[PDB]
Design a protein around this nucleic acid. Sequence first.
RNA 1: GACAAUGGUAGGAGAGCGUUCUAAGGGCGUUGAAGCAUGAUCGUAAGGACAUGUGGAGCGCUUAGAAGUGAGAAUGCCGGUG
RNA 2: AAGCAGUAAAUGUGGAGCCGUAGCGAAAGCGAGUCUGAAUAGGGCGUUUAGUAUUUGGUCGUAGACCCGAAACCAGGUGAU
RNA 3: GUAGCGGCGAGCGAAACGGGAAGAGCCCAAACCAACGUUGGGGUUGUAGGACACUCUAGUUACAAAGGACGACAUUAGACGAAUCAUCUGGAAAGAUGAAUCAAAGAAGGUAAUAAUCCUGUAGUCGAAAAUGUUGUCUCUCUUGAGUGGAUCCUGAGUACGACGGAGCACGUGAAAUUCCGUCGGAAUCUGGGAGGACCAUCUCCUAAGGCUAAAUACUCUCUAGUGACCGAUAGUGAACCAGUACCGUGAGGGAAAGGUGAAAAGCACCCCGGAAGGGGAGUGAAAUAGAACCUGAAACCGUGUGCU
Lengths: 192, 64, 144
Amino acid sequence: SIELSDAVFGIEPNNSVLFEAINLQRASLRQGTHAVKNRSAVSGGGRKPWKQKGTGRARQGTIRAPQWRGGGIVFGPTPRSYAYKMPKKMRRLALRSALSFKVQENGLTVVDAFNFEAPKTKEFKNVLSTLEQPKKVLVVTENEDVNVELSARNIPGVQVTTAQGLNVLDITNADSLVITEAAAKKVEEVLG
Amino acid sequence: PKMKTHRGAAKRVKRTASGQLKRSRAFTSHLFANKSTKQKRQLRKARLVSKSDMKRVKQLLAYK
Amino acid sequence: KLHELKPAEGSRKERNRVGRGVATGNGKTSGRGHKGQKARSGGGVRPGFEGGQLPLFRRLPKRGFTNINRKEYAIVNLDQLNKFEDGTEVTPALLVESGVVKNEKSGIKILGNGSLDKKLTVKAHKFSASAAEAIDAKGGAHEV
RNA sequence: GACAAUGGUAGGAGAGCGUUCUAAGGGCGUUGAAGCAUGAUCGUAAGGACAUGUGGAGCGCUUAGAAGUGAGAAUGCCGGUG
RNA sequence: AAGCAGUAAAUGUGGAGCCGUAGCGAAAGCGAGUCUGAAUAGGGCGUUUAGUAUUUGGUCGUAGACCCGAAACCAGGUGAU
RNA sequence: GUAGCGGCGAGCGAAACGGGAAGAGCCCAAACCAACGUUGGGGUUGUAGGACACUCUAGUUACAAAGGACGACAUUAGACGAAUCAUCUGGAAAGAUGAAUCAAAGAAGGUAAUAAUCCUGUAGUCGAAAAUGUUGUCUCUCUUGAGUGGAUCCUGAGUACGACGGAGCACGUGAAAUUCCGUCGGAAUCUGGGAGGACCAUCUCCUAAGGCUAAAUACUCUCUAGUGACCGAUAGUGAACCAGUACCGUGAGGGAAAGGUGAAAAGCACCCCGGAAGGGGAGUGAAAUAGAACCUGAAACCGUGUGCU
């Protein structure tokens, strides 16, 4: 009933670009927030403990040296960022690869409009069980559906997204995809 | 931060198409009565930096 | 799948760690050698040279000057003009638009490197002897 | 199947073991986890299992990711004991 | 790129700017050829004319830069029990 | 890391253009008029403005002039808030095995082991005596507008600028403009004055020597609500524990070590050896080689008894 051009949902996936996109997204939602103290930042240790020579002991300059107990750390963690970027043309080749791979293994379900008037988890649970859907499902619409997102969100294993919120991680983590005709048309028109 | 060019070296060489550097000759400032005509006429021509010298000063001129 | 991931063949390599035992091959001296200036923490001499013999970039003379009123022209050879339909008109506002000139430094200049095989009128800031002859050699017009 | 090569310091190149944390999948555990102790066990090496005692609550496996990632020596620092 | 929208995300949008497609000359300048030169006469550098963006590994530079160790210098204070 | 500066060595290092965030501009001195030098009015500029003489009427309390009554929110205590039973092992069930239920609530913490339905909670709603903050609606408080004429008058003086000695401009005195200080000299008045990197002429742009002004910007001693491929007691702040403390120095000042019974104290009634500490039974407890010097309990080192020598 619904025709979709083979440019999306009908290409051969690119595994290298998909791996790069997965690693990029997963690394870009990680914050540093870690720090240690070096020689200068540890409290005290200004004077020399004993004279350079004359007594039989190893020569020392401060009580906060790296080899003392309680001294400063050398070459430790320091706060930074882990995110990086890739060409725009490769960010879109990775997404079509995910959609095509999902289509390949019969994990695509085109349905009519979701007709919900009030949030209710049991109705959507029954709807999911009627359509024979797996444990992990991603459901895609065109705009923000309040009555669809309020329900279907306490069920462990279901997430809701729009057409311009699609992810490489959401598609790969999900086991099957359920979409609407308007959402499918928007996905086909936006991508390429 | 950013690397810094050698300002004294950028005043003495130019970059060619193949990537080499064109230089000027020494021993031409004064005291020309002590040099023969053949020497002074052949010191007007230009030369290129040798590969022995290139291995040492290539990083000093990277933006040039 | 997220539980079966594989980077492309030959795209990754493990870093080398020094000072981690003799079997690695970089154990004790960590590849530096024995008892020199280059074997200390903080490195050695400057990249050019320091001390010693007079450097090469000090025994050679300086040369030339720089003109502040310098003009550089974006060049288009005769081959790049074949993409246009025969009988069309070429203007500096359209070469930038169609994808021949990217940056207009100080005007457009036409150089005669290639074959034209067209009858198109082109107007630019400068022309060479070959560019103006070859353009007029098959029918056309030009202006400055 | 036939032949050939395989001593090695400075140093260059390649392939691997193990340790802590993260992701996905799949598992073990009061009918007893980690840790500790003993054993006549396995692999070419780094190393990996199993059985029995003690212990009383957490921990492995596969594929990827990231490092405060391996100690015998610095008249090294701290504690215990000759 | 900055910015804007977005869950401190992914990626939309954003074409100021950057590298390459053409060199030679101190410069004016000319241009597949230019400089020197009275003279392609000879000679030098070019005519290869496929790059560009992200990223794993090696090495370098600027930051203490593989770790520990001085004799000293300067600045402001505390001391005649 | 370009132009440039530099024992032209080491090294130092810009701006305009363009792309963005945010974005309101104004008040005085003088000419001149009225009063007893004074205070009022008039007046603020480069397409040249103003004075004089000619017809003449949007409250901006963050600059722009400064005192007050006038409804909605936010913060500071809180209240409601769905859904589970049975057997097995065990000291104890939340685990295993069967039957169910809720979900705009499957974040988290506790409860005798591992809980969406046991407890505090969560999603979602409800709520303010009284105090403070932020905003809006009248009241309230000020209020003079544009072109034509330019006879004549005004538009910031020991100021601008110069020489000498310094400094600052990316620019080390260099061909050094542009701008600041000390000393000594010292202008012009719209047919005026300044700038366009020594300097002169022509062109273009502007109008010094008085003052005021929100926003985009920097930081965190703090309060409230959260986050992490950050630490887990030689780590993390010096300090998880009565820590700037014991202690050390005349003084300024320097500076540690030290966490863990058990689910519940149920913290061993009573008998025996002894002066007591300590122990052997009996009891508590799932466990006492869990008995407060208490989870686990490695190596060095110290002992007792034994097969072969």
